[PDB]
């Protein structure tokens, strides 16, 4: 049940996920998955990053759901569950700003 | 600025109208984002409600003067974006409403 997943944060707002991730305590790659407020039916992967110019910043990647079942962020690979997606990007960035290292506290 | 509660960065105009049009949000709820259309400028999107159009969002461009400051009108200029959000929280001065809540 994804409601009980560590990394899943439900209907928190875009602003609240940024408030949770932009924090000195979080590694580059701290992340969370939530519902998109702007696109019903889509999810969103928010990831903390750090670039020298802007400091700590958050990038948000939409996650679309295939009507047939899976989930995707790019045309390179698709996944049968959000857990599977979270695991692939924990191993390879594959276009994301950073590999998912840490689940947002 | 990336750390100001009200600064939403690079969202589009559709996104801000999707985050702001919430019927459970007070009039004057707002966010500052970047202008897509005008490079270098900002935009202050603000929810409003009038009898006829109902809930709607007004978008106000914020221009940065080359010396440094910011303006929405010729009456006042601000040496920083937070002084602009602080002034219009206390005075509408032509905006549809004083700024009340930051977009949730």
Closest-CA distance, B25 to chain A, in angstroms, reads 14
Q: Do B2 and A37 touch (CB under 8 A)?
A: no
Taking contacts as CB-CB distances below 8 angstroms, the residues of chain B near A19 are: 5
Q: Would an 8 Å CB–CB cutoff place A23 in contact with chain B?
A: no
* Residue A91 CB-density burial (10 A; 0-12 exposed, 13-18 middle, 19+ buried): exposed
Q: Are strands A71-72 and B7-9 parallel, antiparallel or unpaired?
A: unpaired
Q: Are strands B54-64 and B42-50 parallel, antiparallel or unpaired?
A: antiparallel
Q: Are B90 and B39 in contact (CB under 8 A)?
A: no
Q: DSSP assignment of B10-43, as one string?
A: S--HHHHHHHH--TTSPTT-EEEEE-SSSTT-EE
Residue A47: both structure tokens together: 């990831």
Residue B99: both structure tokens together: 């700024």
Taking contacts as CB-CB distances below 8 angstroms, the residues of chain A near B103 are: 15
- B70-71 sheet: strands from edge to edge: B7-9, B30-34, B42-50, B54-64, B70-71
Q: How far apart are CA A96 and CA A59, in angstroms?
A: 9
Q: How far apart are CA B5 and CA A58, in angstroms?
A: 14
Q: How far apart are CA A63 and CA B38, in angstroms?
A: 29
B2 closest CB neighbour out of A15, A37, A54? A54
Q: Would an 8 Å CB–CB cutoff place A6 in contact with chain B?
A: no
Q: Do A13 and B19 touch (CB under 8 A)?
A: yes
Question: Which phi and psi angles does B63 have, rounded to 5°?
Answer: -105, 145
Q: Would an 8 Å CB–CB cutoff place B18 in contact with chain A?
A: yes
Q: Give the DSSP H or E segment for A50.
A: strand A43-51
Q: How far apart are CA B31 and CA A88, in angstroms?
A: 34
Q: How far apart are CA A41 and CA B56, in angstroms?
A: 24
Resolution in angstrom units:
2.4
Q: Do A15 and B5 touch (CB under 8 A)?
A: yes
Which domains are delineated in chain B? 1-104 (3.30.505.10)
A15 closest CB neighbour out of B2, B3, B104? B104
Contacts of B44 (CB under 8 A, 6+ apart): B30, B31, B32, B59, B60, B62, B72, B84, B85, B88, B99
Q: How far apart are CA A40 and CA B18, in angstroms?
A: 11
A28 DSSP 8-state letter: T
Q: Would an 8 Å CB–CB cutoff place A51 in contact with chain B?
A: no
Q: How far apart are CA A45 and CA A29, in angstroms?
A: 11
């Amino acid at each position: 049940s994804i409601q009980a997943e560590e990394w899943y944060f439900g209907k928190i707002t875009r602003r609240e996920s940024e408030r949770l991730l932009l924090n000195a305590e979080n590694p580059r790659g701290t992340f969370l998955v939530r519902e998109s407020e702007t696109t019903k039916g889509a999810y969103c992967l928010s990831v903390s990053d750090f670039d020298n110019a802007k400091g700590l910043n958050v990038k948000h990647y939409k996650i679309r759901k295939l009507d047939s079942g899976g989930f995707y962020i790019t045309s390179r690979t698709q996944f049968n569950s959000l857990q599977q997606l979270v695991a692939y990007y924990s191993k390879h960035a594959d276009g994301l700003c950073h590999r998912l290292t840490t689940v947002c506290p």
